[PDB]
Design an enzyme around this catalytic site. Sequence first.
Site, PDB file in Angstrom:
ATOM      1  N   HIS A 248     -17.136  13.466  34.173  1.00 38.63           N
ATOM      2  CA  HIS A 248     -17.283  14.802  34.846  1.00 38.63           C
ATOM      3  C   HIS A 248     -16.881  15.693  33.760  1.00 38.63           C
ATOM      4  O   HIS A 248     -17.586  16.962  33.663  1.00 38.63           O
ATOM      5  CB  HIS A 248     -16.074  14.698  36.009  1.00 38.63           C
TER       6      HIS A 248
ATOM      7  N   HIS B 286      -8.801  20.984  30.871  1.00 39.52           N
ATOM      8  CA  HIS B 286     -10.238  20.605  30.585  1.00 39.52           C
ATOM      9  C   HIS B 286     -11.026  21.767  30.829  1.00 39.52           C
ATOM     10  O   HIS B 286     -10.415  22.843  31.220  1.00 39.52           O
ATOM     11  CB  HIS B 286     -10.712  19.489  31.664  1.00 39.52           C
TER      12      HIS B 286
ATOM     13  N   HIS C 252     -14.900  23.616  32.609  1.00 39.27           N
ATOM     14  CA  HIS C 252     -16.093  23.519  33.078  1.00 39.27           C
ATOM     15  C   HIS C 252     -17.139  24.366  32.347  1.00 39.27           C
ATOM     16  O   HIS C 252     -16.749  25.464  32.148  1.00 39.27           O
ATOM     17  CB  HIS C 252     -16.358  23.642  34.660  1.00 39.27           C
TER      18      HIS C 252
ATOM     19  N   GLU D 185     -16.297  28.410  37.205  1.00 36.47           N
ATOM     20  CA  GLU D 185     -16.149  28.171  38.604  1.00 36.47           C
ATOM     21  C   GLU D 185     -15.742  29.351  39.631  1.00 36.47           C
ATOM     22  O   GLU D 185     -16.317  29.691  40.578  1.00 36.47           O
ATOM     23  CB  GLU D 185     -14.991  27.036  38.589  1.00 36.47           C
TER      24      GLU D 185
ATOM     25  N   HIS E   6      -9.288  25.132  32.151  1.00 40.37           N
ATOM     26  CA  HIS E   6      -8.204  24.810  33.308  1.00 40.37           C
ATOM     27  C   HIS E   6      -7.037  24.238  32.462  1.00 40.37           C
ATOM     28  O   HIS E   6      -7.149  22.967  32.255  1.00 40.37           O
ATOM     29  CB  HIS E   6      -8.806  23.733  34.316  1.00 40.37           C
TER      30      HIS E   6
ATOM     31  N   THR F  89     -10.814  21.710  42.341  1.00 39.44           N
ATOM     32  CA  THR F  89     -12.114  21.911  42.216  1.00 39.44           C
ATOM     33  C   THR F  89     -12.973  20.736  42.101  1.00 39.44           C
ATOM     34  O   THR F  89     -14.435  20.640  42.155  1.00 39.44           O
ATOM     35  CB  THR F  89     -12.561  23.047  41.388  1.00 39.44           C
ATOM     36  N   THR F  90     -12.298  19.643  42.116  1.00 42.38           N
ATOM     37  CA  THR F  90     -12.940  18.268  41.936  1.00 42.38           C
ATOM     38  C   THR F  90     -12.391  17.435  43.099  1.00 42.38           C
ATOM     39  O   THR F  90     -11.172  17.554  43.231  1.00 42.38           O
ATOM     40  CB  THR F  90     -13.025  17.431  40.539  1.00 42.38           C
TER      41      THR F  90
HETATM   42 ZN   LIG Z   1     -11.000  22.463  36.586  1.00 37.36          ZN
END
Ligand SMILES: [Zn+2]
EC number: 4.2.1.1
Length: 259
Positions: free
Chosen positions: A63, A93, A95, A105, A118, A197-198
């Site tokens: 992911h 991590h 996005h 995000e 994040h 958010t996941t």
């Molecule tokens: Zn994140």
Amino acid sequence: SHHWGYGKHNGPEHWHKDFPIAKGERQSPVDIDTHTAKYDPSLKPLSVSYDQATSLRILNNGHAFNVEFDDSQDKAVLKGGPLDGTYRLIQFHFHWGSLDGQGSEHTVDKKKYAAELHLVHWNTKYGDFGKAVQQPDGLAVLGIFLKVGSAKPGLQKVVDVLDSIKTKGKSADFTNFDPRGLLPESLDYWTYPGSLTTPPLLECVTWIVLKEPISVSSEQVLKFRKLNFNGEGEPEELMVDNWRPAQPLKNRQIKASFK
Ligand SMILES: [Zn+2]
């Protein structure tokens, strides 16, 4: 099963099927409306103590990629701002997008950045990460927008090992990484209560989203976009657009640290 992704049928719009909290009251991310987001003078100064941060490894989980840290003691801790007590860094991590005009995000007045970092911390009130994620005050995530421009020297050590973790399931030793090298010059921020958010999308996050983006080079971003969602040997699926869109703010207020 409950496999999830960012594609047409397994992506954010469908997460609710397996994770019904996806339609909850405190989901993340959100759009930040600067006009309605009010200065809170009661927010204390934000404190990061990262001099003794000990990074351990980097991994592609299919992911994103995570850089994981030793969280066995208070060696990399966030305090102050909206937070009560001490939050230990466990991982960071990113996005990011297929295109520079999307990837973040959180959004600011509907504006999307090229990516979002994040830094994930958990509340030592609860004694481990697993216990913290089950509590509304369990996590603190520091969100940092990326825009494309000047290279970010402190990111280069990350970018330089992504070839070793191209595909899902890959990991490598990753020591002596200094997360301070990923910070912007100003730590003005917005904060609100929200969620992972996941999946599992638990509503355990105090969000702290920095106003000032860091700049990274198109070269650095390109390296992100060369990653794979897939495992080795499987059909290629470029790891891009691994971002969840803005969710309903519902009852919530977003506070600003700055006048
Ligand atoms: Zn994140």
